[PDB]
Amino acid sequence: SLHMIIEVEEVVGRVCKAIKQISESERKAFIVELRQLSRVNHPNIVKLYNPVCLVMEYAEGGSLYNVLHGAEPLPYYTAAHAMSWCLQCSQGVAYLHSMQPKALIHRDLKPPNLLLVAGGTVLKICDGSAAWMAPEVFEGSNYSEKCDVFSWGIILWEVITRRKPFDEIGGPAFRIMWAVHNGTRPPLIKNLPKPIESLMTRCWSKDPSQRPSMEEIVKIMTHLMRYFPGADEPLQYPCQHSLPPGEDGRVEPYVDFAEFYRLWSVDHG
């Protein structure tokens, strides 16, 4: 089904303030996108409400990328938020993978396409990118849903460290592609829990078959939230920001896992 429908407000980006727009050349790319959006319905995916145009829900928080790296002042967030964000992301992507008749692939998963609402607590998927792109994709191979798992792995490293992936490399896109294709991955995280480290490295394996499914990622992340309480708390506290460059191929995390090891000790010991 598809609902039919406003006061046009100030422009937000390149799309005004929930709307989007056609540029009549994109009228064909528009039809391919709308047909699939009407079939999709999920909490962690953006809600769609003459001339040709859409009406999405206006996420006041903006993109996850803007929250993590955008204009100051940036908000404070915890390990709970970071894990919750990645959990809700894998929930929405799993919905797309588990779709009949054909499994819908997102292809371009990255924080700039992940919106936040309800005080930065609820994450929603919204259908340059070399940092999050799986190696088999930009080489020109028969890629599959497992390329979204690679992207998720990079996003997991990104919210924990609050670092732009492959910012040390920089340059044009082909320089990042060359690195990822040769095997370079983001540096490991200091004092990162072994369960999280294991899921992250698996998610960005060279061989796509060795990466876990999104259903497996959701289930694992759901059981880990037991040890990450406080994801419902809205973001409201400021954050004065200084980043130390990570020498010797190892970086410090932004979030703090102290509470995780504490709660983990109670159950296991």
Count of residues in contact with ligand 6L4, rule CB under 6 A: 12
> Residue positions in the annotated binding site for ATP?
12-15, 20
Residue 63 as a binder of ligand 6L4 (CB under 6 A): the answer is yes
Pairwise CA distance, residues 157 & 201, whole Å: 10
Sign of CA dihedral 232, 159, 126, 74: positive
> Residue positions in the annotated binding site?
12-15, 20
Binders of ligand 6L4 among 7-26, rule CB under 6 A?
Answer: 12-13, 15
Pairwise CA distance, residues 75 & 239, whole Å: 6
Residue in the shown chain whose Cβ atom is closest to ligand 6L4: 126
Q: Which of 113, 121, 151, 205 binds ligand 6L4 (CB under 6 A)?
A: 113
Torsion of CA 201, 88, 34, 146, to 10 degrees: 20
Residue 128 as a binder of ligand 6L4 (CB under 6 A): the answer is no
Residue 59 as a binder of ligand 6L4 (CB under 6 A): the answer is yes
Looking at the Cβ atoms of 16 and 258, the one nearer to ligand 6L4 is: 16
Residue 56 as a binder of ligand 6L4 (CB under 6 A): the answer is yes
What are the angstrom distances between the C-alpha of 97 and each of 86, 110, 149, 161, 213? 16, 17, 11, 28, 9
Pairwise CA distance, residues 214 & 220, whole Å: 10
Q: Which DSSP category does 238 fall into?
A: E
Residue 151 as a binder of ligand 6L4 (CB under 6 A): the answer is no
Residue 258 as a binder of ligand 6L4 (CB under 6 A): the answer is no
Residue 115 as a binder of ligand 6L4 (CB under 6 A): the answer is yes
Pairwise CA distance, residues 51 & 8, whole Å: 14
Binding footprint of ligand 6L4 on the chain (CB under 6 A): 12-13, 15, 46, 56, 58-59, 62-63, 113, 115, 126
Residues with catalytic function: 108
